[PDB]
Design a protein around this ligand. Structure first.
Ligand code: SAH
Ligand code: SAH
Ligand code: MG
Ligand code: MG
Lengths: 242, 242
């Protein structure tokens, strides 16, 4: 209700990680990520680390992996669902060719305006069409207007986790055959490994249940082939078969 | 030569995981890997788990990830350095198109012949050219023979870990611009995160030092872009820039 509102300090999982030690994660970041991180990504990460919802920020080592994937598959047109301050968005725009185009959807443009000066300084604002909306209505409108030639090469889904299964039903039609859909956080701090997990914030417990259901659904879905990857907070890559 | 025993039972790190939870790794395998693992991959894995050198077997979740990379980048010609019983080789052969081609190099053909019946039942043996040799003389001969039009799309390096840096100097010339080189085990059970790590077999300590040196070298190498991925025992994806 009325008060000071939602704080990430109310959340039980903010200090969890899927790797064995903080020392290993820190080693990966210092050895293999920070020396390869664009200066504007560094700046955007450092301001977002001070933001009240910093727990949502995509991991920097995951960012370099998404960039690698985009280049290896020669992605040109992508969609991002869940922008926040724009780290994965800027990662994607930097990875695409000069003529690459991104459709970026988030309910809260004020987060995006935190990253926008870094995006602009990186010279890649022209690649981004930002839509301030709930993603589901936008995706449903796209299904009525987009033609086969307009299909996306790549989708990154990092928005409200309980809705991933709903996003999936749209994105297997909006991503081209052979294209990729990447769902972020599908290991949810390791909590998905347990049928019951004590002491979670109600929103954290909802996401544990939804990800346990989503992970089973994707593994059974004959429209895609999958790879769940233990990077960041876990992600699942889906490649559309038909 | 004469010295101390170096069988798998002599190693210290065999049971150590880079993920913090045995339950989490089991969850990934049971939920997202086994339901998507080819029947002949399952059979090949089950035999290899009983083998004298089972610690060297590539992780099954890493297998699905390598398959996804191969499909997303439309790889057609690849090279594997380090075959063992052939799990990553069969993964690769199943991923490639019908007319794909793999050059597979290993010093020990008897290991490969353990997995060969599974590769044959999968119907993809025809894609594989197995070369029984140390890899370095083969790569040096390839440098003298390979034309630009025959450069490999993809290279998987999983053989003798101290030699990775030597393999790299050849493979950045044998893989096409924009092609990928994947080095396996670059987190080495997490021991790379520490300047000193007590309790290791001398060969385990040698790999810890070599990977710490390799991880710095790749992070600084202008010929490639990199992504180190905390999957399996860690891997580093390199994409050749020029
Ligand atoms: N229904 C919805 N539709 C679109 N965006 C939503 C949404 N519900 C939540 N979001 C947004 O999804 C974002 C999740 S955080 C995303 C992190 C970002 N991709 C990064 O790289 O760091 C938040 O910004 C939130 O505002
Ligand atoms: N110098 C060398 N040249 C080529 N292969 C070598 C080598 N030294 C060791 N090897 C081989 O490298 C292999 C490493 S284990 C490889 C694992 C396999 N790729 C999998 O998917 O499970 C062993 O089979 C070993 O025989
Ligand atoms: Mg996320
Ligand atoms: Mg290996």
């Amino acid at each position: 209700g009325p008060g000071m509102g939602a704080s990430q300090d109310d959340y039980a999982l903010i200090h969890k990680n899927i790797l064995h030690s903080e020392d290993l994660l820190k080693y990966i970041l210092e050895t293999s990520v920070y020396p390869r991180e664009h200066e504007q990504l560094k700046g955007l990460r450092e301001v977002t680390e001070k933001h009240e919802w910093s727990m949502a920020l995509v991991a920097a080592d995951e960012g370099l992996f998404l960039s690698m994937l985009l280049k290896l598959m020669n992605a040109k047109r992508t969609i991002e669902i869940g922008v926040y301050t724009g780290y994965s968005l800027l990662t994607t725009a930097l990875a695409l060719p000069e003529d690459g185009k991104i459709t970026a959807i988030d309910v809260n443009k004020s987060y995006f305006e935190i990253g926008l000066p870094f995006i602009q300084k990186a010279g890649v604002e022209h690649k981004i069409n930002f839509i301030e909306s709930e993603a589901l209505p936008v995706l449903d409108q796209m299904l009525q207007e987009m033609k086969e030639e307009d299909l996306y090469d790549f989708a990154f889904v990092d928005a409200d986790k309980p809705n991933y299964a709903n996003y999936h039903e749209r994105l297997v039609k909006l991503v081209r055959v052979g294209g990729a859909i990447v769902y972020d956080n599908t290991l949810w701090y390791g909590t998905v490994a347990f049928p019951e997990y004590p002491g979670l914030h109600p929103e954290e417990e909802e996401c544990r249940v939804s990800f346990r259901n989503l992970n089973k659904l994707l593994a059974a879905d004959p429209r895609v082939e999958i790879s769940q990857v233990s990077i960041g907070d876990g992600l699942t890559i889906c490649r559309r078969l038909y």
